[PDB]
Structure formats: structure tokens, C-alpha cells
Design a protein around this nucleic acid. Sequence first.
RNA 1: AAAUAUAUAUUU
RNA 2: AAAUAUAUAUUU
RNA 3: AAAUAUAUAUUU
RNA 4: AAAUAUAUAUUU
Lengths: 219, 219
Amino acid sequence: KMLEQLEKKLGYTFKDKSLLEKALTHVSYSKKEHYETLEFLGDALVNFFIVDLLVQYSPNKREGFLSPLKAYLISEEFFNLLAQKLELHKFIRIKRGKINETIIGDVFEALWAAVYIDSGRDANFTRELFYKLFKEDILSAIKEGRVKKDYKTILQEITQKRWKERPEYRLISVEGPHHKKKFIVEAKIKEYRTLGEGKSKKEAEQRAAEELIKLLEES
Amino acid sequence: KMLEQLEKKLGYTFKDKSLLEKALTHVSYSKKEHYETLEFLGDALVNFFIVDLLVQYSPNKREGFLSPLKAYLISEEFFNLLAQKLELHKFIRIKRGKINETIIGDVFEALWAAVYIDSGRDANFTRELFYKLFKEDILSAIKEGRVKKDYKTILQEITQKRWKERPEYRLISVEGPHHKKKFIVEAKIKEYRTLGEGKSKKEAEQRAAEELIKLLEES
RNA sequence: AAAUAUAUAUUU
RNA sequence: AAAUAUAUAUUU
RNA sequence: AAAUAUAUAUUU
RNA sequence: AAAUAUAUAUUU
């Protein structure tokens, strides 16, 4: 079977083939054995794998900084960047409707569940096999701070949550001393204020937001 | 210290007695260093410990059915049910305030993140210890449920979730004397059906419900 | 046996 | 709530 | 049983 | 927010 082309990239050789196929095969292809179950488990799994790696390498080890940074790590957006190293989609077995941005990301979770279950439920073995493939990528996504949405959206949701209030944006500067074009706005919430410059009134408001995000992690 | 008593309950003696204490230290007690990042880890950890147990020990391994169970099995109220079996309350230490309901759950998450790490990050181990205790409980919190809904109710949520529609009950006949009669009702959904007998129509429907439930989990 | 009251069961 | 069945107290 | 209320589930 | 159904309660 062409399975071997995946085991090679994965770095593991299944002892129970149907298992591997199951995590790959979609319901539309066979409603009798699809990745619904494995996907469910894989979520909890992969999550742990990542949160663990994160908690262990996060610059600012604080839940106020982790929560948002984890969003991108356990998101289907990232799952594909990780799944692409496997070209998982090629091995998928879907029928009704071509591959979907989230269907693969859902297959990515099913897979690791399949490896986990095939190893005798050896968490340690599996977790390792997982770091051997993406630990580096995750560490990178963490060294940069990759967020799931623009800072402005994040900030808003944060404030509306904590204070049922949206942030305030005020323009402070539209020019420099020698008449150049640079915008300066003060993102503000409650009594917490920050500054942000940008080539645009918007780019300046996304900066000031990013700042008002840190200035709140520890409240 | 006094932790030796907790370690006696857990069945695990820390190498770094500080961890156990860091997990048991609430912000108020010592914002210097408390159970906050450690709980964040155990959050994902404990999540995986159960979702794993759930999947392999659930009557129905369908996402529609697992989702709601795993929802309670990880609630900040089910943890107190677990943690109290170790008096985690008398062991935690907070300065200003009192043991809140959902705070026992935040320290609980951090309690195993402590075992895990001190254990040398042995998920397999940190997982087996967890089962050594909270297995029977989790194994039961799946059958009854948070509210212990009655059979007819359970079936209805099942059918509505999977097919967006409710089942059909209908009386078939009565048996025995005129004072001590017995009813026979048929539970039916789409193309499935079971028969229930009872001293009362509902008693009978109920039984038929818990029979159509099994026949539905064996789909 | 009937009735009032109440409890239990079923029914509406 | 009503009915029917039984039980207990009560009246006849 | 009807109405009402509470909860839960699904739908708009 | 509403509709419908299930469970219980309450009033009748």
C-alpha cells in the first residue's frame, strides 16, 4: 500500500494498518471507519504535546501571555503548517467535497491518535515522535509570538471580557518635526495607556494595541 | 512538612518538595510564585488524561456523544469532586480569602502538572498514577452524568443531536388484572425500535428509552 | 357494604 | 385537580 | 390530565 | 429572544 510513503515521513511504521487508514479516511469515503473518534482524542493529545512544549519554552511563563499564544498553536491554521511537512492531504481518503482547510487539520489530530493507539498508548513514545517532527517549528512560532488574529481584535475581546468595554483610540501625531509622514495614536483602556507609531493611522493602532496587550498580561 | 500527608494520599513522594507547594500556593498567599502556569500546563495535561479515558471507556464513541460527556468530565466542578477525595482544600494555602469552588480545580490542574514534571515528565507514569485513583469516578461520571438525566431525556438529546429530531413512543397494550395492569410501549426512531414494559406508561417508555439508547450506541 | 378525610398506584 | 383501586382513621 | 414555572436538548 | 419536546415542581 502507498501508506509507506507516509510512515517514512512520519517516522513510525504501523503494526495495524487499518488503524492508520482510518485516521486518513473520511466519512464521505467510508461512514464505517472514519477519523471522527481519533480526531476527538488527537485533539486532547496534540494539545497536551503543544501546551507542554509551550509552557516549557515560553519566554513569559504567564497564563495571561500563554492563552493567546496557544490559540495559534492549537489552531487549524498552524496544524496545516505542521501537517504540510507530511503532505497529509495526499494520503487523505475523502470523497464528498475536495480537501478542506479544516478537514486536514482534523485529520492531523486523528493521525497522532492512530500512532498513539498503535504504540500501546505509550504517551512518552508518541510525544517524542511528535517533537522530532515539529518541536522546532513550535519553538519558532513561540519565539516570534505568532498570534491568531490582529492585536486590535484580541485586545477588544479581552477588554469586553474583563470590562464589557472596548478600547479607546486617539490620534496624537500625524507628522514629524521636518514634515514627514508618520502616525502616532494612543491605544487606551481604563487608565492603562500606550503609544503606537505606523505608516498608517491603522498600522499605528495595531501597534498601540499590541502594546496594550502586554501592559495587561499581569494586570 | 504537612505535605507528607498529601503525598500519602497521592501515592507519590516529590523529589522537589517545592513543586507540590508551588502548585498549592494561591496568588493571594504569594503572588511571588503561585500555581498559575503550572495549572495552565495541567489544564492540557488533565484534559488529555480524561479525554483518553473517555474515548476508550465510552459506550458510544461518536463525537456528538463524547463532546457533552467530556464537557462535564473537565468542568471546574467535577475536579472538586475528585480533589476533595484528597482534601486538597486543607492542603492548599491562600492568604486573603477562602477556598473558592473553582479554585480547587485550578490548583488541581497544577497538582498533576507538578507530579508530571517532578516525575521527570513521564506522561505514561503521571497518567497511570492518575488512573490508580480517579478511574472509578471518571468511569462513573460517564454513566449517570452531572444531572443524571432520565432515559427518555437522554435519548431525545441523542436523536436531536445526530438527526435533529425526537423519537416516537406509542402504547401497544395492557396486561394483568384491572388494578395491577402492565403497559407495553414501543420506542422508535427512524428505522430502529425497542419494546418497554412497566406498571405505568412512562415507566414503560423509560425502559424502552434505555433500550433504544443501547441499540443506538451499538450502531 | 356506603361515605368523609388522608396516603399509595394507575388513568385523564 | 377528577376518576378508579387498595390501605388507615372516622361516620353510618 | 390542563395551565404555569424551572431545568436541559434541538430548531428559528 | 422565541418555538418544540423531555424531566420535575407548583396551582387547579
